[PDB]
Design a binder for this molecule. Structure first.
Ligand code: NAG
Ligand code: NAG
Ligand code: NAG
Lengths: 221, 221, 221
């Protein structure tokens, strides 16, 4: 009857400290005649019952969106511990189990190059800052933006694209007020990837990124 | 029960006169006992005979795949003509009428900007050239790289991504060797979208464009 | 009789995800008459028996010095959760309970400024890079040196010093060869602090960071 959908945690809440990691073993299409879904967890074999019991959520099509969330510590998740999720349901003929861990494979150091806007874009009242993050592995990666140590929110991030060499790459455009950009403000693009040292790196740009030694040869007629 | 997958025309072919759109209805999962299938084309309810049928190929799973392509006028697709492929077979109780047409989404023109590689990437053996396309609507765009008219092959392109203004945007990275880059080869990225004037535009770069040094001329009065 | 010194994890380990933090429960002046040691740990009163105990060793003073390493996850120490170590020694009148936790107080975001080497440094073969870090709170902070994504080891860091306004400040001197610094090799300062956004900040520092040399040419014909 009911099916099971397993979701690995996002890179954001497992690659950095102040957001806890949590694996999302979800059960779907649980009908009204068997609302009980039992949550059992294994992390590299040892049974753990510290998961939080999210109560059942009804659905429009008379099913159940019941979610099992397992609290994790970051280091062991980085070690690829397998999450055996044991779920037993009355309409389920047997206890259905699913497994997931860290996406294995040789990690690649994500080279981060932050590119300035093109000169022709400076005509428009809004300006775009781009952050190429290329040559990484796996696709688990997050990119944010910040200026003066405070995050920005008018940015978007394109999904990763497979590269020829077996790596991946992605871009992220931060659109800000052009007035804030011409004032010499500094913008820094943050990259959180497992291969990085301390699982974090940063690069920055300013208005005066490409510039000689201030040869301000100005002609007035 | 055989099913039909309908191919919309590629945006590049619809928006380029030299190329041509190919609306195609694809018939799959046809048992070998009854591979006789006929297609009835109705362009706004008009039976048309121009359809061409390619040779059929057997699938690995002991089913058959008989295909029929249809070259079409550019204005007919650009004006949202209703396209119907009526699939008839002895193994289907009812004909399949899948209709395909272009959307009426108010098209907003893009604003192509392309950026030279960052100074950090100049050290690596290969540089990356990005052709950002921003602000367009709808999401049908093909981006092509080339140098001196020869279309470059080794390049990738991110899928269109929604923005905060309701439009779309995308990038495209070209894997060009650093040795070819430093000689100043001129590379041009091509943007093909229906909202453009003539439905085509391009931007070309060189080391001179976006050079790290810039004599700040400030020709003012 | 025997005494107990309790030590917190080093700021680097608790401040970055790459390493592990340990709360140390040292027992000193442990006589050979009753070498019995018992290690208990309360995490907000929650007993945990995951601790690792190193074997005993002999000092100059005819006693052992055993320790109790306790491996914890970073968010728990960063949450201010209380920790306690109980050691039951027969000679002492009662087993001694010692508590430890995060140094509380309103967090202050560190401000990072990089100062290029003085004009007197180019005479010597090894210039000094200074990463001023000031105006933060509390004194748990790690500073590392990175060049093109790789750490440097020829660096030192002053302990935090009380400032005028109650905050702390510390510097860090990275010694590089004058050839590398004069080659335009990029250098940046990494700061691990609990009050920073994503617990990380970086500041670029180069020859181009200095050398403003306003070359202001004008022509008013
Ligand atoms: C350079 O000249 C321009 C044009 O006169 C002026 O606006 C600008 O302030 C000058 N900058 C410097 C650093 O002298
Ligand atoms: C470069 O020239 C432009 C155009 O006049 C001017 O606005 C800008 O301030 C100049 N840059 C510097 C650093 O002076
Ligand atoms: C540079 O010179 C320009 C005119 O050439 C002047 O407007 C500007 O104020 C100067 N900037 C300085 C001296 O910083």
């Amino acid at each position: 009857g009911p099916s099971v959908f397993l979701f690995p945690p996002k890179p954001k809440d497992t690659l950095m400290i102040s957001r806890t990691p949590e694996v999302t073993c979800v059960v779907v299409d649980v009908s009204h005649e068997d609302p009980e879904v039992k949550f059992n967890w294994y992390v590299d074999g040892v049974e753990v019952h510290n998961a939080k019991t999210k109560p059942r959520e009804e659905q429009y099509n008379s099913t159940y969106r019941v979610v099992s969330v397992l609290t994790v510590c970051h280091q062991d998740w980085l070690n690829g511990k397998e999450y055996k999720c044991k779920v037993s349901n009355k309409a389920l003929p047997a206890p259905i189990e699913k497994t997931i861990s860290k996406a294995k494979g040789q990690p690649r150091e994500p080279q981060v190059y932050t590119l300035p806007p093109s000169r022709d874009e400076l005509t428009k009242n809004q300006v775009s800052l781009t952050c190429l993050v290329k040559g990484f592995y796996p696709s688990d990666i997050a990119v944010e933006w910040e200026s003066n140590g405070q995050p920005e929110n008018n940015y978007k991030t394109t999904p990763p694209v497979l590269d020829s060499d077996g790596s991946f790459f992605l871009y992220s455009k931060l659109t800000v007020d052009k007035s804030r950009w011409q004032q010499g403000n500094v913008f820094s693009c943050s990259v959180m990837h497992e291969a990085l040292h301390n699982h974090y790196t940063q690069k920055s740009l300013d208005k005066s990124t490409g510039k000689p030694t201030l040869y301000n040869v100005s002609l007035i007629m």
